[PDB]
Enzyme design. Structure first.
Site, short mmCIF file in Angstrom:
data_model
loop_
_atom_site.label_atom_id
_atom_site.label_comp_id
_atom_site.label_asym_id
_atom_site.label_seq_id
_atom_site.Cartn_x
_atom_site.Cartn_y
_atom_site.Cartn_z
N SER A 129 -4.06 -62.76 -10.76
CA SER A 129 -5.43 -62.46 -11.53
C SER A 129 -5.50 -63.05 -12.81
CB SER A 129 -5.57 -60.69 -11.72
OG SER A 129 -5.49 -60.02 -10.60
N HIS A 135 0.12 -55.67 -18.59
CA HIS A 135 -0.82 -55.35 -18.18
C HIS A 135 -2.17 -55.80 -18.35
CE1 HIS A 135 -2.56 -52.50 -14.58
NE2 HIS A 135 -3.64 -53.29 -14.60
N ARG A 183 3.16 -44.58 -12.47
CA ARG A 183 3.20 -46.10 -12.96
C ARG A 183 2.17 -46.30 -14.28
NH1 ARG A 183 0.42 -51.22 -10.86
NH2 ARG A 183 0.99 -52.73 -12.67
N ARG A 230 -3.29 -59.23 -0.42
CA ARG A 230 -4.39 -58.94 0.50
C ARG A 230 -4.12 -59.59 1.79
NH1 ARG A 230 -9.07 -62.51 -2.70
NH2 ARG A 230 -8.96 -61.08 -4.70
N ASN A 251 1.41 -57.57 -14.45
CA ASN A 251 0.79 -57.09 -13.44
C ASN A 251 -0.08 -58.33 -12.70
OD1 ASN A 251 -0.84 -54.72 -12.22
ND2 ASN A 251 -2.72 -55.62 -12.96
N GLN A 252 -0.03 -57.93 -11.35
CA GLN A 252 -1.06 -58.90 -10.69
C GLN A 252 -0.94 -60.47 -11.15
OE1 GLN A 252 -4.06 -55.34 -8.87
NE2 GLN A 252 -4.95 -57.49 -9.64
N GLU A 306 -0.13 -50.04 -6.46
CA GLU A 306 -1.68 -49.42 -6.70
C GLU A 306 -2.29 -49.64 -5.26
OE1 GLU A 306 -4.37 -51.56 -9.51
OE2 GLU A 306 -2.32 -52.11 -10.61
N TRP A 349 -3.87 -45.91 -7.04
CA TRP A 349 -4.71 -46.05 -8.26
C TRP A 349 -5.85 -45.07 -8.22
CZ3 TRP A 349 -3.57 -48.70 -12.49
CH2 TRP A 349 -4.90 -48.91 -13.29
N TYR A 387 -5.55 -53.66 -1.79
CA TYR A 387 -6.76 -53.07 -1.77
C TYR A 387 -7.54 -53.50 -0.51
CZ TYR A 387 -6.38 -51.24 -6.40
OH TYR A 387 -5.72 -50.54 -7.51
N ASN A 445 0.53 -54.52 -5.11
CA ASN A 445 -0.78 -53.71 -5.06
C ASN A 445 -1.72 -54.17 -3.80
OD1 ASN A 445 0.08 -53.03 -7.46
ND2 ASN A 445 -1.49 -54.12 -8.92
N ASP A 491 -12.47 -49.11 -25.95
CA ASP A 491 -12.34 -48.52 -27.13
C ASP A 491 -11.82 -46.96 -27.55
OD1 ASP A 491 -13.02 -50.93 -28.40
OD2 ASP A 491 -14.93 -50.05 -28.98
N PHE A 499 -11.63 -52.92 -15.56
CA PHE A 499 -11.94 -54.05 -15.75
C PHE A 499 -13.12 -54.64 -15.02
CE2 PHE A 499 -7.18 -53.70 -16.46
CZ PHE A 499 -7.08 -54.03 -17.83
N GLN A 528 -6.87 -49.33 -20.08
CA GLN A 528 -7.89 -48.60 -19.53
C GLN A 528 -7.88 -47.37 -19.76
OE1 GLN A 528 -6.72 -50.67 -15.43
NE2 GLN A 528 -8.74 -50.17 -15.28
O1 LIG Z 1 -7.84 -58.03 -4.11
C1 LIG Z 1 -7.64 -57.53 -4.92
O2 LIG Z 1 -8.09 -56.20 -5.12
C2 LIG Z 1 -8.29 -55.75 -6.79
C3 LIG Z 1 -9.53 -55.08 -7.04
O3 LIG Z 1 -10.61 -56.00 -6.72
C4 LIG Z 1 -9.71 -53.67 -6.40
O4 LIG Z 1 -10.71 -53.05 -7.02
C5 LIG Z 1 -8.09 -57.21 -7.33
O5 LIG Z 1 -7.74 -57.11 -8.90
C6 LIG Z 1 -7.78 -58.08 -6.17
O6 LIG Z 1 -7.80 -59.63 -6.66
C1 LIG Z 2 -5.55 -52.82 -9.87
O1 LIG Z 2 -6.81 -52.65 -9.49
C2 LIG Z 2 -7.39 -51.50 -10.18
C3 LIG Z 2 -8.74 -51.09 -9.38
O2 LIG Z 2 -9.47 -52.50 -9.44
C4 LIG Z 2 -7.59 -51.95 -11.77
O3 LIG Z 2 -8.30 -50.86 -12.52
C5 LIG Z 2 -6.19 -52.19 -12.20
O4 LIG Z 2 -6.00 -52.52 -13.44
C6 LIG Z 2 -5.41 -53.16 -11.18
F1 LIG Z 2 -4.37 -53.63 -11.97
ZN LIG Z 3 -15.27 -51.70 -30.17
#
Ligand SMILES: O=C1O[C@H]([C@@H](O)CO)C(O)=C1O
Ligand SMILES: *[C@H]1O[C@H](CO)[C@@H](O)[C@H](O)[C@H]1F
Ligand SMILES: [Zn+2]
Ligand SMILES: *[C@@H]1O[C@H](CO)[C@@H](O[C@@H]2O[C@H](CO)[C@@H](O[C@@H]3O[C@H](CO[C@H]4O[C@@H](CO)[C@@H](O)[C@H](O)[C@@H]4O)[C@@H](O)[C@H](O[C@H]4O[C@H](CO)[C@@H](O)[C@H](O)[C@@H]4O)[C@@H]3O[C@@H]3OC[C@@H](O)[C@H](O)[C@H]3O)[C@H](O)[C@H]2NC(C)=O)[C@H](O[C@@H]2O[C@@H](C)[C@@H](O)[C@@H](O)[C@@H]2O)[C@H]1NC(C)=O
Ligand SMILES: *[C@@H]1O[C@H](CO)[C@@H](O[C@@H]2O[C@H](CO)[C@@H](O[C@@H]3O[C@H](CO[C@H]4O[C@@H](CO)[C@@H](O)[C@H](O)[C@@H]4O)[C@@H](O)[C@H](O[C@H]4O[C@H](CO)[C@@H](O)[C@H](O)[C@@H]4O)[C@@H]3O[C@@H]3OC[C@@H](O)[C@H](O)[C@H]3O)[C@H](O)[C@H]2NC(C)=O)[C@H](O[C@@H]2O[C@@H](C)[C@@H](O)[C@@H](O)[C@@H]2O)[C@H]1NC(C)=O
Ligand SMILES: *[C@@H]1O[C@H](CO)[C@@H](O[C@@H]2O[C@H](CO)[C@@H](O[C@@H]3O[C@H](CO)[C@@H](O)[C@H](O)[C@@H]3O[C@@H]3OC[C@@H](O)[C@H](O)[C@H]3O)[C@H](O)[C@H]2NC(C)=O)[C@H](O[C@@H]2O[C@@H](C)[C@@H](O)[C@@H](O)[C@@H]2O)[C@H]1NC(C)=O
Ligand SMILES: *[C@@H]1O[C@H](CO)[C@@H](O[C@@H]2O[C@H](CO)[C@@H](O[C@@H]3O[C@H](CO)[C@@H](O)[C@H](O)[C@@H]3O[C@@H]3OC[C@@H](O)[C@H](O)[C@H]3O)[C@H](O)[C@H]2NC(C)=O)[C@H](O[C@@H]2O[C@@H](C)[C@@H](O)[C@@H](O)[C@@H]2O)[C@H]1NC(C)=O
Ligand SMILES: *[C@@H]1O[C@H](CO)[C@@H](O[C@@H]2O[C@H](CO)[C@@H](O)[C@H](O)[C@H]2NC(C)=O)[C@H](O)[C@H]1NC(C)=O
Ligand SMILES: *[C@@H]1O[C@H](CO)[C@@H](O[C@@H]2O[C@H](CO)[C@@H](O)[C@H](O)[C@H]2NC(C)=O)[C@H](O)[C@H]1NC(C)=O
Ligand SMILES: *[C@@H]1O[C@H](CO)[C@@H](O)[C@H](O)[C@H]1NC(C)=O
Ligand SMILES: *[C@@H]1O[C@H](CO)[C@@H](O)[C@H](O)[C@H]1NC(C)=O
Ligand SMILES: *[C@@H]1O[C@H](CO)[C@@H](O)[C@H](O)[C@H]1NC(C)=O
Ligand SMILES: *[C@@H]1O[C@H](CO)[C@@H](O)[C@H](O)[C@H]1NC(C)=O
Ligand SMILES: *[C@@H]1O[C@H](CO)[C@@H](O)[C@H](O)[C@H]1NC(C)=O
Ligand SMILES: *[C@@H]1O[C@H](CO)[C@@H](O)[C@H](O)[C@H]1NC(C)=O
Ligand SMILES: *[C@@H]1O[C@H](CO)[C@@H](O)[C@H](O)[C@H]1NC(C)=O
Ligand SMILES: *[C@@H]1O[C@H](CO)[C@@H](O)[C@H](O)[C@H]1NC(C)=O
Ligand SMILES: *[C@@H]1O[C@H](CO)[C@@H](O)[C@H](O)[C@H]1NC(C)=O
Ligand SMILES: *[C@@H]1O[C@H](CO)[C@@H](O)[C@H](O)[C@H]1NC(C)=O
Ligand SMILES: *[C@H]1O[C@H](CO)[C@@H](O)[C@H](O)[C@H]1NC(C)=O
Ligand SMILES: *[C@H]1O[C@H](CO)[C@@H](O)[C@H](O)[C@H]1NC(C)=O
Ligand SMILES: O=C1O[C@H]([C@@H](O)CO)C(O)=C1O
Ligand SMILES: *[C@H]1O[C@H](CO)[C@@H](O)[C@H](O)[C@H]1F
EC number: 3.2.1.147
Lengths: 499, 499
Positions: free
Chosen positions: B188, B139, B93, B257, B184-185, B407, B455, B328, B326, B68, B463, B37
């Site tokens: 996902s 990540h 981080r 969550r 990471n996560q 995050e 974050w 959100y 993390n 890029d 992403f 990122q």
């Molecule tokens: O619950 C969630 O939060 C984050 C993102 O959606 C927050 O912007 C994500 O990667 C999940 O699965």
């Molecule tokens: C944690 O969520 C943030 C917000 O969407 C993403 O940018 C990070 O890459 C993800 F790990």
């Molecule tokens: Zn490119």
């Protein structure tokens, strides 16, 4: 008797004096492109030109431009066919992106059916407009996975992966495609990709360029060149033994140049000039016509030059039905030292020649070909008679081959505005002056040349230069790439083709 | 007694009432980032986020944006450290790009010494300003070569390649880095990368999304999740057995969550809510705390759920020194059918739950979190109390772990102009309201939370969204990315940290 001009001003842009009827009735006229330069990355895997341009952005071009979206021929392939149809072209050279049809490199890992469909539709559309496809299997865009697994053409594993890729192409498209090119400009990847590191993959000796990730400029160009010849030859054998029912032809692409002595009464410059023919052309044409490298290369390169086994020599020798010859310019050659023990030694130094566009008495060889703004003493100049000299040489030295000129063209600066870019009279002059000499050599020397494909169909990403130069016969606006509008050169070429 | 707000308006942005002194004196405060990122592609090999964003540009974001060049933390890492120093942050981080230190994926193929040097300089600079690094090994940016060789985390070959990469990181940076995150996560990639194909690598069943190149949304998420747990656990074992002399800690990152019933008097909605905890959190925390998947997953997923051998169970169980959590948002859960025989079945349907932000009586759970302009009924809403609920749940269900919140943050629209973007009061409200609940759960439930990393440090490529949303506490101008200017939220956070 045919008389052709070598110096400005040129008068060959008058289609009353020079047109397609000047040539044999079956002669093919068209334009060329390559996949990295025109398609964009949408729908394909990643290759070493995506890798190199992203890892080394200042090597991609001064603007850091790359082939990410370019003119979007993925979406606008039809507009390419419309340019060709406007020109009344009878040929089009394009390349297949390996990474579009086998994104994972190795065929056993699966094929991309949608990628295959993209080329099927292009090929069908060209044939429906009477355009003969000339299809390059490999225009430098090796799948990145292969360079990361085994360093691509540095390793002999490339041979079978390239063979399996080519087999897929022949099986899917060979019922319609009858002219195949294997590897674009054999000399280029070894020297620029593994010697100077100006091109992907970007390998070289540490003191040549500290940014290279790995390499050895003295040895790797030879290894890569050798594997290219073997992979080429394996593909030609596969084509000729398993796809003879398609009734097509295959060959390599050479980059050609002519060479003249920097001082034509100095035996040392004369010798350097002959060495350059052997090291530049003979490096590949010796193997392709005799199964061996030139003796001067054997002698100079010594243990750094790989040997062909008897089986390999036999496979490589004669591995072409025709040659695709690209031609842009000619250089003067003078002697230069070959410091084989220097840590910055490169394979290119082995020829013992320094190349210039100005001879010892101060004569520039011909009109401007490419301005170098950082360094004007490095400008490139062209030489129309060089196409005559090259074709004559190939007929005389290399057993009277069937030839197609697979690239010939000139750039204009990307700083020009649209109006200036469309008024590309310097491109008419370049193209016509070369076509005059091409017709002259066919008539006077009886060289078996059967087509001509001008570089390029339209503006595109130029390797090493980004979008800082334009080569197209049709103009593309980078802020909205859908249209390809014929420039003055495209309009001229249309009249040349149908006078 | 601590009282925290759940609904607008919030009053926790007043550092007289809520600041770092509200928390224990050793508590770490900072911000987070990830390599894809923020760094750009310069100096590294290609990974599957470069592959996916270039092959499927409309999945990269609505603007087709990608990593890029992004904010160019390759060149401007020092400016990142300056943001942190301005904040008086005690933690940061960041992630190591596998493709920057081992561009060829497999460590035996060589390392990129300049890549290693890039992270050495960042780490040294952070430590010199008193900032504790929390370093994510993975990540999501897997080297593309590994996805092309064997489909990355779909194959067990990933385990040893990830282990050798992690070993290199520990050997080169572990004398300075004392807090490591593995993957990471965990939820996902399996779900979005191999289920819905919203994320790299972009695999799914043909009728889920015809653009996927391959896949099976019903089976592959489970295979990938399983390999992630095994690769994680192998790396933790390696760390704890071979790098114990560094005196550091390692753990996974979970996306958390909270879940509430869509109808809190309906036993079916209540059951769906408990199933969601097991399928979302327990999928990974069951293995991490007990060496087995949750029984509801065993029962529902049946033959599609891989088994751990006794040796594997033992390796995975207890494979953490801490958890990076993390957080959100929170969702309401109601029952939904699980059509396992449908060709468009996905692993996500196995939980038998439909998720919303509005409950059965029409109550939106909390303030706006993310507007969806194509579809406003798909807007996301946040729920400050969910951080309290999640931490309490982890302490009670998952054996009182040591936690770092790795995050937490909120986006603002990329359409806002600079002035609007800097006046990010909605970000102060989000951050403060969560921090209030975090302090409350630490005090009331005695959850062992020891840091918080918001974050994000600065605006970056998001992403799936390109540059169409901003998450930074510092603003970056995409026309000139050198500066990172603290927004109102960054300024608030600076005062919260040093009141
Ligand atoms: O619950 C969630 O939060 C984050 C993102 O959606 C927050 O912007 C994500 O990667 C999940 O699965
Ligand atoms: C944690 O969520 C943030 C917000 O969407 C993403 O940018 C990070 O890459 C993800 F790990
Ligand atoms: Zn490119
Ligand atoms: C077209 O391809 C043909 C081959 O199909 C080329 O002809 C071959 O040319 C090579 C030289 O490149 C000649 O090979 C030399 O053979 C000597 C004679 O050996 C034979 O009798 C012995 C001789 O005393 C003996 O040991 C050997 O076992 C045979 O009995 C050799 O000593 C030469 O080797 C020395 O020189 C090499 C560099 O040239 C060096 O690398 C070796 O270490 C050694 O120092 C050479 O022998 C070759 O050595 C390397 C080994 O890998 C090879 O297999 C081995 O052959 C060939 O005899 C000759 N073959 C025939 C059938 O003619 C032809 O070359 C052109 O024409 C020949 C006449 C010569 O003038 C070349 O200079 C010129 O390039 C190729 N044509 C073109 C235009 O390239
Ligand atoms: C924490 O981890 C522990 C394990 O370390 C979990 O306890 C294990 O829970 C499993 C159920 O998931 C129990 O396994 C069942 O054992 C039955 C009893 O078998 C033993 O005696 C036989 C019994 O008649 C016999 O054939 C077997 O050879 C032993 O002698 C089984 O029939 C069950 O298998 C059926 O059900 C499976 C789905 O659960 C299905 O996949 C099988 O095909 C079969 O239809 C199951 O046997 C397991 O079968 C699959 C095979 O791969 C396993 O190796 C095999 O064990 C375990 O006995 C129990 N182990 C012990 C040491 O308690 C614990 O589970 C939690 O607690 C247990 C009490 C139970 O309530 C679970 O529902 C609950 O999840 C895990 N804790 C958490 C919180 O997840
Ligand atoms: C094209 O190449 C030719 C052949 O090499 C150049 O002509 C040669 O130029 C040499 C000077 O660079 C001449 O040698 C010199 O002769 C003068 C008069 O005797 C003498 O005083 C010098 O010191 C020098 O002599 C050499 O010294 C080094 C020794 O190793 C060597 O044995 C000596 O020869 C040489 O005579 C001349 N050769 C011929 C066959 O004419 C030619 O140079 C151009 O023309 C010559 C005549 C002279 O006017 C140069 O100034 C002029 O550059 C070169 N052409 C160009 C345009 O560079
Ligand atoms: C929260 O969930 C609860 C529990 O499910 C919902 O309450 C239930 O709502 C059902 C209507 O969706 C009630 O059943 C109906 O009862 C009327 C009166 O007898 C009857 O005419 C219906 O046809 C229907 O009966 C069901 O028919 C299907 C059969 O399979 C089943 O056995 C019958 O029960 C049900 O009585 C009621 N349960 C309770 C314990 O109160 C609740 O729904 C909300 O409150 C109920 C009282 C009613 O006012 C609904 O209109 C209102 O939506 C739901 N809350 C929300 C906000 O959706
Ligand atoms: C290029 O590779 C060549 C061949 O491995 C290296 O050249 C050799 O250098 C070794 C060490 O000096 C010498 O012992 C050999 O005699 C040389 N072999 C020949 C074939 O020339 C060369 O040093 C490497 N260059 C780089 C820059 O690493
Ligand atoms: C997903 O992979 C699963 C398992 O290979 C496929 O499900 C099987 O489908 C085969 C063919 O119908 C059935 O015979 C099996 O009973 C199913 N196995 C189980 C484990 O469910 C499924 O069809 C594939 N889905 C896609 C879309 O290809
Ligand atoms: C084509 O060029 C030839 C000269 O090669 C000329 O004689 C002929 O008239 C030209 N054709 C047209 C249509 O101008
Ligand atoms: C020809 O194709 C056949 C059948 O697939 C294969 O057995 C043979 O090896 C191929 N070969 C070449 C390059 O001759
Ligand atoms: C190294 O090469 C550069 C270009 O080849 C040259 O200008 C320089 O003199 C060389 N130095 C040495 C030590 O040979
Ligand atoms: C871009 O060019 C195409 C073809 O000229 C045109 O039709 C389209 O309207 C243009 N798009 C924009 C945004 O101007
Ligand atoms: C196309 O070229 C053919 C062959 O020379 C010619 O007969 C035909 O008139 C040309 N068409 C156009 C539209 O120029
Ligand atoms: C910090 O917040 C606490 C309440 O937790 C408050 O009592 C203290 O005065 C505040 N510190 C400053 C410097 O405002
Ligand atoms: C530990 O490192 C040693 C030496 O390199 C190695 O033999 C051993 O297998 C490593 N192992 C793990 C993950 O324990
Ligand atoms: C396939 O799935 C989409 C979303 O899961 C759903 O709306 C549609 O009804 C499904 N169709 C079938 C045939 O199950
Ligand atoms: C870009 O931003 C940096 C830092 O503010 C500034 O110093 C530099 O002059 C700016 N570049 C341009 C081209 O404006
Ligand atoms: C940095 O934080 C430390 C610890 O709370 C504090 O004592 C110091 O004054 C702060 N510095 C600034 C410049 O805010
Ligand atoms: C361009 O890039 C390379 C790193 O890829 C760096 O070594 C070099 O200094 C840069 N070149 C210039 C002239 O800035
Ligand atoms: C976006 O891209 C995919 C090809 O990658 C294509 O299948 C799809 O139609 C496009 N989506 C939209 C909504 O245009
Ligand atoms: O001689 C050559 O011409 C082309 C190019 O420089 C023309 O623009 C090239 O790739 C060579 O090696
Ligand atoms: C032939 O040269 C043209 C002009 O440089 C390049 O664009 C082609 O890719 C090369 F093959």
């Amino acid at each position: 008797e045919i008389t052709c001009q070598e110096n400005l001003p040129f008068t060959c842009g008058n289609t009353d004096a020079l047109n397609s009827s000047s040539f044999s009735s079956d002669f093919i006229f068209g334009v060329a492109s390559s996949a990295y330069q025109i398609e964009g990355t949408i729908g394909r895997g990643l290759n070493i030109w995506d890798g190199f341009t992203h890892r080394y952005p200042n090597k991609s071009g001064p603007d850091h431009g790359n082939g990410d979206t370019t003119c979007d021929s993925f979406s606008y392939w039809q507009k390419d066919i419309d340019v060709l149809d406007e020109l009344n072209a009878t040929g089009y050279r394009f390349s297949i992106a390996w990474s579009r049809i086998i994104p994972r490199g190795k065929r056993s890992r699966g094929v991309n059916e949608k990628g295959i469909d993209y080329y099927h539709g292009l090929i069908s559309g060209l044939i429906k407009k009477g355009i003969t496809p000339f299809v390059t299997l490999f225009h430098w865009d090796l799948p990145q996975t292969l360079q990361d697994e085994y360093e691509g053409f540095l390793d002999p594993q490339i041979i079978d992966d390239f063979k399996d890729y080519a087999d897929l192409c022949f099986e899917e498209f060979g019922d319609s495609v009858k002219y195949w090119l294997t590897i674009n400009q054999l000399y280029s990847v070894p020297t620029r990709g593994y010697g100077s590191a100006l091109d992907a993959p970007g390998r070289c000796s540490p003191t040549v360029d500290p940014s290279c990730y790995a390499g050895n400029s003295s040895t790797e160009p030879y290894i890569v060149a050798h594997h290219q010849l073997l992979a080429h030859a394996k593909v030609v054998d596969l084509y000729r033994k398993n796809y003879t029912h398609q009734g097509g032809k295959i060959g390599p692409t050479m980059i050609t140049r002519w060479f003249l002595p920097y001082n034509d009464t100095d035996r040392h410059s004369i010798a350097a000039t002959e060495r350059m023919k052997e090291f530049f052309l003979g490096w590949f044409m010796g193997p392709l016509t005799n199964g061996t490298y030139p003796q001067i290369m054997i002698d100079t390169v010594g243990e750094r030059l790989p040997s062909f086994s008897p089986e390999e020599s036999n496979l490589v020798k004669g591995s072409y039905d025709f040659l695709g010859l690209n031609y842009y310019f000619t250089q003067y050659a003078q002697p230069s030292p070959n410091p084989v023990n220097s840590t910055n030694h490169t394979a290119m130094m082995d020829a013992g020649a320094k190349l210039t566009y100005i001879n010892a008495s101060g004569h520039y060889i011909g009109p401007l070909f490419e301005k170098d703004k950082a360094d004007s003493t490095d400008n490139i100049y062209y030489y129309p008679k060089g196409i005559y000299s090259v074709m004559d040489y190939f007929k005389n030295k290399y057993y009277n081959p069937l030839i197609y000129v697979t690239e010939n063209g000139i750039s204009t600066p990307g700083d020009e505005n649209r109006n200036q870019s469309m008024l590309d009279y310097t491109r008419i002059d370049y193209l016509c002056s070369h076509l005059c000499f091409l017709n002259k050599v066919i008539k006077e020397k009886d060289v078996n040349v059967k087509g001509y494909l001008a570089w390029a169909l339209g503006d595109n990403y130029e390797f090493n230069k980004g979008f800082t130069v334009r080569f197209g016969l049709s103009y593309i606006d980078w802020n909205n790439v859908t249209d390809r509008d014929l420039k003055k050169s495209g309009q001229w070429y249309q009249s040349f083709i149908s006078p």
